[PDB]
Design a protein around this ligand. Structure first.
Ligand code: ATP
Ligand code: ADP
Ligand code: MG
Ligand code: MG
Lengths: 523, 542
């Protein structure tokens, strides 16, 4: 039955036409009596063959591009994943209960788009860019592809500028540069969102103090979250004024798994508007561990072979091609940047899980948030021994770099001395200096929620702690000693430290002088 | 023009099927796709059976239509090789991605070849001094051999592989090839820029004085490009070995990503998956690549490869298969890194074939085996030391725990590439200073010193330099009250005079967001294409 024997059936070999001529005069009368039972034929449109599991099989669509938006006649979007010889498998961006077998699939003629621009700033959109805040359509905006390739080696430069989080433990010990991706990884309920929200609130405080080219425009992508959590978060950004600079992309827990899978690419494309036009972006992918679970659902429903923890083989490429778009661009490309904060939830502190170790291999540092430090009230529960930022170090505040070298070191000894003897075997006077200074600096670094600190008030507060000026207070009123420090010093000393960037020797002993005339609550 | 020009029949992610009306291309042939936005080459992987080939895209396939013309180039992917490729960055298909003009080439070699034959192998073992204590002592590297650095996502195998570029690759005197396979693009920019300021890469008219050529297939690439960019990094290294006849250093960052990219592809080639979820052909896919990276009788390739281990699992079949392909395996552990020991080398899991008394000498060999013996007997004690403590040990065993805590710290050292984030300057330790230093701690000559004097120091001269400082500090700690430079009149102005020296900057108030922007007028209706390709609103039914 080879094709050598089948392509002989191209040329006619009947030599007897007594049935060709007969039915050629009865076929068109036969088809004409069955026309209200024919659906109209389909070549460049599509018709749905099978729908189920959130994947439609579409007959027709002769000229769909691979991976483009198709539109069902229900109004639902899809994306032509695999073009096959006979059908097209599309993944439905929405509920598949409204797609039937026999429905028309229309072609939009464009690979998957989101509206990007200045007019997407302020808005709450879904995983596809359609706004859900109810205040109209997006205007002053244009469409861009959600699967752009990341800039290459020659389109980048080194990470030089600091992105100030406003979180005290972060901007001192794990400092974030401005084109750098940084993983926020921890267990459930450990302050992972609170570090990312405090970064977004803090950029609002700094955009009214920087000359328009150093303004950070944040983007928050919420994948798999509760819709009440997203609505409580939009209200917090609206009441702090942070929605003027924030895009809120939301694919919640009830949304379709292709919408949750697409939402971090949709939000990265909206934030890449600011990277590509010389501005600076801040993208937060809250639970990128929930986006891999949504993509695992689509890959198993497409009957692709599962690997470790039943994740597909390309779940690394899911996240790596996403986080590679967070770059600092070179000066011929505008000098813009995009810094990412993926969030990974961890089960029982196990950092050696599959998706956790994938994103550690992609991102530049981590912010580990320990459950045990979070239960002790040390919030943000930053695991100092494990949290890294090597691209953002030597890109941080020069004043903070002076005082945090001693802070990281006195915490490095504090973990090492507490490793030896926490129970009272014998206490040296030299090591009880370390436990007295270590518990001083730990209470120093813990700060409360939704009030990020400027970097000049943050340098002074650690200057007052790595040096003397706080050894009088035991451990308890150090939180109250900080506003005793930062309100009682002359507020000009924050202006010189901000404008120079570092602690000059003129300001050094001026600030020793102001820290001796502050009145400390532990007396 | 009609035959030997096939058309795209089906697209499933990275895998394209092309149907050729006659004269199918050979397997491993390169196929160009006409009318794509970027240059899309496809490497033929399978003949499917009905005049269809199954091929792997070396770029993205978003945009492919099921009729698109595909021309066959009649040959595999052929990349520029030679001395003209030095100092350039190439991608998987040999295109320059450094904006330095076209790569002038001595030859254009295909990236697919067989291993050198068994008669072509060279069996010679001379040591490669790396300046790293735990490497040069316990698992010493062979000068023409295969070296693997095994790691688990953040344990330090890129810092170690940049340190070997710093230590070995400047005193080597030959050409280097850095094949970056599926790692960070930020790290590709860092190495490229730091090689320009090191003079390893020279730009402009002095390009021929470069010593390194870079091939990059980093982790933003589609899985076809990451599955073949190790092969075009070897082809550049194999030209210097075969034709130029000299000694090459091949540094492959994450040869695991070659195995992982073939595993993303293999699901879509219609294969039954093997164990954990990998390709059925894992050992022969990796074997066919690794057997090309050898020292032959005409030239040498000293190959250092980073090997990622997934979920810290060394029994995962992609790390487990690589172990047989290497002369020296440097296994980096996560628990060693959490004790602050850097490089986080497991001393009882790293192995060389050079640890042989007829190769490195009996003085070197007995120190390495004695260092491993006390570290192993200490590991046998750690179950009791956790529960009962050190108070329940024999004092014969306390001398083990005291010595093995000391050499565990002494195996760590600062790196000259880690000084930019640790602050500590890096120490190259010679082999003779490594052997004598660990021999002193084994015989007992340094039981005086505390265990933190051994931490992050170069050689045994410097633990005595650091122990003296530790003793001295415990005495002198304070008495810096005044008569230093902090006088309020000598070196220091008024505080309010410093406010006026601030250059006040102007703030523009308007955010600059609509200066160049052009807004597409998005319609109130979903715009679609009807049966004739016309931009039509979405019709009203379901
Ligand atoms: N710095 C802080 N100080 C005091 N309380 C905090 C701080 N950070 C978080 N909390 C509280 O602890 C809880 C942690 O919430 P958050 O949403 O930040 O954690 P999460 O890790 O994102 O949790 P989930 O995984 O459930 O989203 C919240 O109820 C928050 O109000
Ligand atoms: N030799 C070292 N000295 C100091 N720190 C190190 C060393 N090796 C690794 N680290 C720390 O661990 C991190 C591991 O980074 P990298 O070497 O890029 O890991 P990977 O093995 O995943 O490539 C580094 O950013 C650094 O902070
Ligand atoms: Mg949260
Ligand atoms: Mg690495």
């Amino acid at each position: 039955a080879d094709a050598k024997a089948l392509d002989e059936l191209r040329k006619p070999k009947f030599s007897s036409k007594y049935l060709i001529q007969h039915v050629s005069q009865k076929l068109i009368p036969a088809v004409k009596e069955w026309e209200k039972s024919y659906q109209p034929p389909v070549i460049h449109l599509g018709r749905v063959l099978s729908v189920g599991d959130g994947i439609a099989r579409v007959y027709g669509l002769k000229s769909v591009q691979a991976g483009e938006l198709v539109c069902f006649d229900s109004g639902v979007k899809g994306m032509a994943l695999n073009l096959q010889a006979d059908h097209v498998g599309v993944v439905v961006f929405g509920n598949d209960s409204v797609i039937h077998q026999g429905d028309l699939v229309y072609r939009t003629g464009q690979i998957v788009n989101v509206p990007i621009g200045p007019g997407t700033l302020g808005r709450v959109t879904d995983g596809l860019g359609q706004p859900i805040d109810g205040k109209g359509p997006l205007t002053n905006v244009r469409s861009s592809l959600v699967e752009v390739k990341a800039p290459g080696i020659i389109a980048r430069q080194s990470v030089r500028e600091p992105l100030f989080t406003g979180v005290k433990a972060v901007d001192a010990l794990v400092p974030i540069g401005r084109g750098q991706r940084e993983l926020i990884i921890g267990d459930r309920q450990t302050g992972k969102t609170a570090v990312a929200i405090d970064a977004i609130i803090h950029q609002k405080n700094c955009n009214e103090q920087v000359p328009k080219a150093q303004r950070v425009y944040c983007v928050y992508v919420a994948v798999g979250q509760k819709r009440s959590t997203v609505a409580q978060l939009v209200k917090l950004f609206t009441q702090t004024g942070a929605m003027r600079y924030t895009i809120m992309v939301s694919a919640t827990a009830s949304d379709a798994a292709p919408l949750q899978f697409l939402a971090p690419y949709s939000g990265c494309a909206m934030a890449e508007y600011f990277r590509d036009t010389g501005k600076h972006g801040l993208i937060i992918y809250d639970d990128l561990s929930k986006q891999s679970v949504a993509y695992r659902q689509m890959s198993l429903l497409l009957r692709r072979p599962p690997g470790r923890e039943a994740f597909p083989g390309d779940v690394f490429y899911l996240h790596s091609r996403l986080l590679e778009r967070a770059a600092k661009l070179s000066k011929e490309l505008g000098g813009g940047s995009l810094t990412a904060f993926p969030v990974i939830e961890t089960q029982a502190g196990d950092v050696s899980a599959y998706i956790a170790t994938n994103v550690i291999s992609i991102t530049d540092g981590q912010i580990f948030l320990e459950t045990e430090l979070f239960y002790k009230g040390i919030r943000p529960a930053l695991n100092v021994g494990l949290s890294v930022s090597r691209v953002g170090s030597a890109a941080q505040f020069p004043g903070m770099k002076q005082v945090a070298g001693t802070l990281k070191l006195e915490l490095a000894q504090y973990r090492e001395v507490a490793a030896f003897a926490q129970f009272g075997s014998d206490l040296d006077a030299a090591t009880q200096y370390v436990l007295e200074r270590g518990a001083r600096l730990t209470e120093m670094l813990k700060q409360k929620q939704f009030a990020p600190i400027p970097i000049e008030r943050q340098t002074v507060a650690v200057y007052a702690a790595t040096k003397g000026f706080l050894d009088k207070v035991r451990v308890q009123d150090i939180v109250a000693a900080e506003e005793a420090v930062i309100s009682q010093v002359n507020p000009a000393v924050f202006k010189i430290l901000k404008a120079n960037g570092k602690i000059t020797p003129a300001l050094d002993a001026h600030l020793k002088a102001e820290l001796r005339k502050v009145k400390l609550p532990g007396a | 023009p009609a035959i030997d020009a096939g058309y795209v029949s089906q697209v499933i992610g990275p895998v394209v099927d092309v149907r050729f009306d006659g004269e199918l291309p050979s397997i491993l042939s390169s196929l160009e796709v006409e009318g794509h936005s970027v240059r899309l080459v496809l490497e033929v992987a399978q003949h499917m059976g009905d005049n269809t080939v199954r091929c792997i895209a070396m770029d993205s396939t978003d945009g492919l239509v099921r009729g698109q013309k595909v021309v066959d180039t009649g040959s595999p992917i052929k990349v520029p090789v030679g001395r003209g490729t030095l100092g350039r960055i190439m991608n998987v298909i040999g295109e320059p991605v450094d904006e330095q003009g076209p790569i002038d080439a001595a030859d254009i070699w295909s990236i697919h070849r067989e291993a050198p034959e068994f008669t072509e192998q060279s069996t010679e073992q001379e040591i490669l001094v790396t300046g790293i204590k735990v490497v040069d002592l316990l698992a010493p590297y062979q000068r023409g051999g295969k070296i693997g650095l095994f790691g688990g996502a953040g344990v330090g195998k890129t810092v170690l592989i940049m340190e070997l570029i710093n230590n070995v690759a400047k005193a080597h005197g030959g050409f280097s090839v850095f094949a970056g396979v599926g790692e960070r693009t930020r790290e590709g920019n860092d190495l490229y820029r730091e090689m320009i300021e090191s003079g390893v890469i020279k730009l402009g008219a002095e390009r021929g004085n470069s010593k390194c050529t870079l091939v990059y297939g980093q982790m933003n690439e589609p899985p076809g490009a990451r599955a073949r960019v190790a092969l075009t990094g070897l082809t550049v290294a194999e030209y210097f070995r075969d034709i130029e006849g000299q000694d090459v250093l091949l540094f492959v960052d994450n040869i695991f990503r070659f195995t992982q990219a073939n595993s993303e592809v293999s699901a879509l080639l219609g294969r039954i998956p093997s164990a954990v979820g990998y390709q059925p052909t894992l050992a022969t896919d990796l074997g066919g690549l690794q057997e090309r990276i050898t020292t032959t009788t005409k030239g040498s390739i000293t190959s250092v490869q980073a090997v990622y281990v997934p979920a810290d699992d060394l029994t995962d079949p992609a790390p487990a298969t690589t172990f047989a392909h290497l002369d020296a395996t440097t296994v980096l552990s996560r628990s060693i890194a959490e004790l602050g020991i850097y490089p986080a080398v497991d001393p009882l899991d790293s192995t060389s074939r050079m640890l042989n008394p007829n190769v490195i000498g009996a003085e070197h060999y007995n120190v390495a085996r004695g260092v491993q013996k006390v570290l192993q007997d200490y590991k046998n004690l750690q179950d009791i030391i956790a529960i009962l403590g050190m108070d329940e040990l024999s004092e014969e065993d306390k001398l083990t725990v005291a010595r093995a805590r000391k050499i565990q710290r002494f195996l760590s050292q600062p790196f000259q590439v880690a000084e930019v984030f640790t602050g500590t300057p890096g120490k190259y330790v010679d082999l003779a200073d490594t052997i004598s230093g660990f021999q002193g701690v084994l015989t007992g000559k340094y039981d005086d010193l505390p265990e933190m004097a051994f931490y992050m120091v170069g050689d045994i001269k410097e633990v005595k330099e650091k122990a003296d400082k530790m003793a001295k500090d415990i005495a002198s700690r304070k008495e810096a009250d005044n008569k230093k430079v902090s006088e309020e009149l000598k070196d220091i102005p008024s505080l309010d005079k410093l406010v006026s020296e601030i250059k006040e900057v102007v703030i523009e108030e308007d955010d600059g967001l609509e200066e160049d922007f052009k807004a597409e007028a998005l319609s109130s209706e979903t715009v679609v294409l009807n049966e004739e390709g016309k931009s039509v609103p979405l019709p009203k039914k379901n």
